[PDB]
């Protein structure tokens, strides 16, 4: 009795960009809606350190950021992990495959996958004309090589002029059939065709979208340009500061012209609805292989996107737009006997690894994350009450504690604080830190932060108190 | 210590078609906005003789129109200049390259560029079936040859029926990847790949757009057709005359149906937003070559476009639509220590040459233009108070003086005058010449014009006074 | 001194579908507008027998319908004419060429053209699987052969399902560059390239459009679908009868759903604006060959299209929609010394032949049509006051007299009459025949009809009076 | 004013006797080169003193002797710190300068006086390492390889048929003939003529990578030689060669091939040369289309020869005629040089091209080691050299030699062995004369010349006025 596993990873998808989680239901995600509502949808799933590299180290190893050391974004840091999610499945006799984005270093280090067909998207560390030929450009991306075999050697990832950290958006400029999202599913179907029939499979399907460039196929772009509402709400509350400058094309903060905000949403949502159709394609193929009833699917995003919310862009922030991720288990064969329903407790990306090994392999994994199995059966025994996350981001480096009621944030280089009522202010528009009615929570929350940060090399804590630090103390890896 | 230089030239782009300079902010130029606002934006930059050939002679040589003799448009006039912008950089050890439009004569005369990959757009003097094979059609344009290699030998520049001096507009009829704007950036990236690594580079990227034909890719055309405002303001004031005829398809004056005015703007703005994305592509490539921090970029247009304003089309007029050009230095490596800000003083296209040689090479150039270096540091010492420009245009030949307060225009074949308050009437809608309250300015302004024109071969001045001349006296080259 | 001549023929274009002639100015024909307004525009030009074959026999020979015998539509009738328009030019030393639609029989009979590159559109008599191979389908049309060489042998003229006599419409389903309208201009440019340089040319450029199928390129179709006015006026007056049935897809009469009427107009107008751009392409090429100033251009349509007006479709009717045609001389080299202006007198398609031979060759042609030369110089000496036209159309066979004030119509199989005031009722909405105030005109008009029809084989006249005839008496050729 | 254009045509690894005009048996088909060489000035005794690619191309471009440049053997990625080069002097004098094809310089895209270089160096190991810089490797190092990927698809590469660039193996080109690198050089030379600056004269280097291996000419030319090469192929084995009797390495420096392999190698090599010959004719026809056939001077040269199995030796880097003697001629159909056209028998070095062209065309001196051949063209031998000192590092077979108009004297300093050949009566070097005492006087003089050239060299060839054996670790390819 060994079920197959498909781990579907998308990059930079917000939790509220799953229509089921959304409040306004504008985004079209009919396939993911069905999957999440029919399985176990994690309504409170979080990427504690919300950017590509630290989130993916956490996904693969189950490790908290202090254990792995990945407290912010840094490329080309060694991945010295043996006990990884695909490695444990391999040890138990699975064929292990990854199609798409790994974002590990060295880029083709397999970390337990038998075989990897790699496309990390646009990575500056793989697109330098003076670095090693075999590790750069079309030799670093099997999708880009496919693009050159398909469109000719002159084709490249940047042909339409959109930057991978930019809010600029416009439709995919080539035939739709060559889009990277289709390619992941096409190659996932090729894996099903060509896999070893004598063993079960663990397959990671890892889409680089909806991470920019924001270039969905024209159909999906025009869909949203035609129907997005007239006014687009940025959830501007009582704490945001506008610097009143023309936005950098790769801005981390600021405000767009309304037309630019509209195009950004149409690109971003368009990429998501496109992923949704292509995942449905993969589901249809699973059925052609008679694997629709013996396979368990977990969908997750590595982190969110601020998308202009609070005058912020990109990620690496403590706010919900960055840290809250969509996440659900889809179990159409009913291999998990727990009653299917939405899960409210605080789940971390670190929990996926031990949950999958427990639920599918019936084994314990010694790591920081914890198996959600008991949550599925309605038992919050031993479950965390809070999450400590953080991210290095220069002046805007953050440290935060999230509970089911509060989010307490500290910016240690600025030495400023925020407090939000997550139940009544889910979009974090009302900073409460300066209201004396919350003096008790704030003192308790500061006390818990000392608990997490005492002893950290950056010097956050001196003599049991939180102290402003200089920007030179911030590191992305411990 | 030798920074690289990229000189980006566009053709027929209005100063107010850079969104940053625009008042209504309708045009989408997010990349150029960022570049101009982050560097030094010249808010008062002018092409004194506003058409292709005299402006480009001024750009390349720094010479005033009396010195070069190019007082209007004329093709196939010798370019007997040795002291040119690329030549000085070559002398100081730079590799010099031009991709795109030169508009010199002979067409492939290099004037200091080591290598030129040429595309002048549609030029009547290069598209005559009875002129030399090697200098005509696809042998005159390396872009057109690319088009024939890409689409087949039957492809040509006029396939969709749009004329290069016409207000008619419609989307590019072929796949977007073959557009001439993409080709300039593709070939600029090929130059970066293949350049001599032992020396710095001076690269001119010279787009033929947004000069007509007005055929942007469909995406950009539809963008504006969908969102341009309902009513399009032509700034019709108290002096324009409407001749009440069906407009010639290559008209120099008149009025369009509202739908034709809308399509013209959608074509023109669409070409500009397309250039903007493609420049962003080139910026991304500069970073892949690790040249994003050791390169100085100057963006400029050779002249503007009347675009229907004042019932005028094309260029060669004294009005702001023709003479005011977008122009800025982008310095992301902070190689220039002056505080970055907008520059208000009167800058001419003649100033680019000596400014670049001063700022980058630390040398003096003996020419008519002057280095803007001191302006960047806040010092208007020795700066001009006024510009004398002109253009031959038959009956509408003009002579004008522009200061920071006034524009005084004389049409010497018509022997009529205009006066505009540039501060309070920036769109030149209120001719003041017949108001007696301005008798003193007008007399002074006429006196200055005698100063500029006394001795000119056309006979503008007889016995110290300005006199009407016959049309046969007008010349385009002295 | 021999000017070149280009005769541009379009098929089924209404006179009021030239924007200059139109009242509402909705249709976009900027190139034709300029040509017609700058030359001599014939505001009252008529195809007396308004369908393809009889109009083209009249165009080529100058003969009235009684002389040629072509009083209605009939295919495969011999063309036993020696004295034709191209033949006279050939005799005077011209190279003669036709590109496009001839509609003669045998199809490749040249009738004075040195060379013909043929595309008659969809012709039922050339699309029969049991008729001669060499004269059918792709062997009858050099455009269709081009389509098979371009798209593959499976391509055909009917691939999108639109019928050549149908009001159904939709965009061209293939790449725009393969449209038949582009092909005429491409092949007209090939003729200019390859012509005999030692002699002048007479070139007929004969477009099959805007005759259905109504499949313009997508750009032009969407243009009108987006901007045509909400309500489309059919000019329904006091005489039309609605048969209240679902319209045949090739209906000669009836009423369409509003959406179908909108799509028909968007297809029809779209084809016309497309022709307009492609004619501008040909004008640009004429200039590349230095023939823009030594060439005289005459534009004409063979007949109109009812387009749903008066609950009528197609042509072959006596009403203005069918009989009034656009027609103008374009003379940018000013080879004709007459002052350029619009021409109001009644001109027939029979007049083109003798006008061109008189104006360009300085010779008399013995035919029924008359040279318009004196009209251009303001002299209506000897000019007709009236036109007698007609068409065989079963029950709706017609006979009519048109003057500058009246149109009098007789339907001899129905034996009904109509009378319209052409000055005050230009759209023929008020039948006056039953108003006693017009008894004198009507009696005179009936008397003139006896004059035209006495002796005709059909038996219209018996003992000096007009008499109802049976449908079996109607013929299309005498 | 009225300055002539110049085309320097360089081929790689072509033997002097693989020009039919120079050959004894006239088997190889080079009709176009025969015409140009016999109608112009053919250098019958032109030499590459250090016969491998990099030292010969340094000598060609700079005019420097191997001791001045330090290039005494093959070595990649040595800096080219030369300002005074052949294209630079023409550029300085107002010429547009262009190279299409093989430069073999370092860094690969250093222009060294060319306004523009369209680069194809052939197969170079230092340009084909997956761990070296992307923009300098494989299809980013070779504009021909990029053209092949654009033409055949990204799958295509330079080694698809399995032939090694240092190998005697041969077979026809496996792709359509129109994509061959020899055609590409001429196609792009025509593109340059189309797009050049019309206001200045041009200096154009057309640098073919062939007939250097892979030995893969188009099928037509391969079959031509397989169908008609003689049954017996002479290796010119004399009284001094020694066979090692091992299976030959596919990139062997010495040995003996099976008959069929030797025949295939000749068919590939000759086939490549006859193919170049047709493609150069193509270029001549294009020159006339641009009306430049009578205002252009052409100099054809090879950088060094190829042993081709002769004396049981392969490749190059040897002191024998197969390696050091190169075809070389000036073609001047416009009669821009007034000297009567004839063949030139005196000793000419590859170092002489640079000063000769600058003298003949520009009327200037260059301060280099080579000398202008102009006086020879006019029949004046006054002061012209009577000997050449050459050498090459090649491990145990490292050589030092003196070539005069009559003798070649060779010293192998690691083996401490000597050879002497009569170049008039024994032009194929089959009879070593060193051990015959009749020649002791000549040998004495030749050793004394070598002492003069080699005194003070860092390798320690000379001690107390005498040539002495050196250890192999003393051998270097570039002097310090
Ligand atoms: Mn990510
Ligand atoms: Mn211009
Ligand atoms: Mn017709
Ligand atoms: Mn070589």
Numbering used by the authors:
A (entry chain B), B (entry chain B), C (entry chain B): 10 to 487
D (entry chain A): 9 to 488
Q: Which sentences did the original study use to describe this structure?
A:
In this study, we determined the crystal structure of an arylsulfatase from Enterococcus faecium (EfAS), revealing a homotetrameric assembly with a windmill-like architecture not observed in other known arylsulfatases or phosphonoester hydrolases. Arylsulfatases, a subset of sulfatases, catalyze the hydrolysis of aryl sulfate esters to produce aryl compounds and inorganic sulfate. Functional assays and site-directed mutagenesis showed that EfAS hydrolyzes sulfates, phosphates, and phosphonates, indicating broad substrate specificity. Furthermore, high-performance liquid chromatography–mass spectrometry demonstrated that EfAS removes sulfate groups from key bioactive molecules, such as caerulein and estrone sulfate.
The crystal structure of EfAS was determined at 1.96  Å resolution in the P4212 space group, with two crystallographically independent molecules in the asymmetric unit. Structural analysis revealed that EfAS forms a homotetramer through symmetry-related operations, comprising four identical subunits arranged around a central fourfold rotational axis—resembling a windmill assembly. The formation of the homotetramer is primarily mediated by interactions between loops and α-helices of adjacent subunits, involving multiple hydrogen bonds, salt bridges, and hydrophobic interactions. The catalytic center of EfAS is located within a groove on the protein’s surface, positioned near the interface between two adjacent subunits. EfAS exhibits a characteristic AP superfamily α/β-fold structure, featuring two β-sheet domains: an N-terminal six-stranded (β1–β6) and a C-terminal four-stranded (β7–β10) β-sheet, encompassed by ten α-helices (α1–α10). In our crystal structure, C61 displays dual conformations: unmodified C61 with its –SH group coordinating Mn²+, and HFG61 covalently bound to sulfate, forming a sulfate-ester intermediate (FGS), likely resulting from crystallization in the presence of p-nitrophenyl sulfate. Metal coordination analysis revealed that optimal electron density maps and B-factors were observed exclusively with Mn²+, not Ca²+ or Mg²+, which correlates with subsequent activity assays showing Mn²+-specific catalysis. Structural analysis reveals distinctive features of EfAS within the AS/PMH superfamily. While the active site maintains core features of divalent metal coordination through two aspartates (D20 and D311) and the catalytic cysteine (C61), EfAS shares the distinctive fourth coordinating histidine (H312) with PMHs and SpAS2, diverging from the asparagine found in classical ASs. The substrate-binding pocket of EfAS exhibits an elongated and narrow shape, delineated by residues S60, Y82, L132, H133, N174, R323, and K324, which form the outer boundary of the pocket.
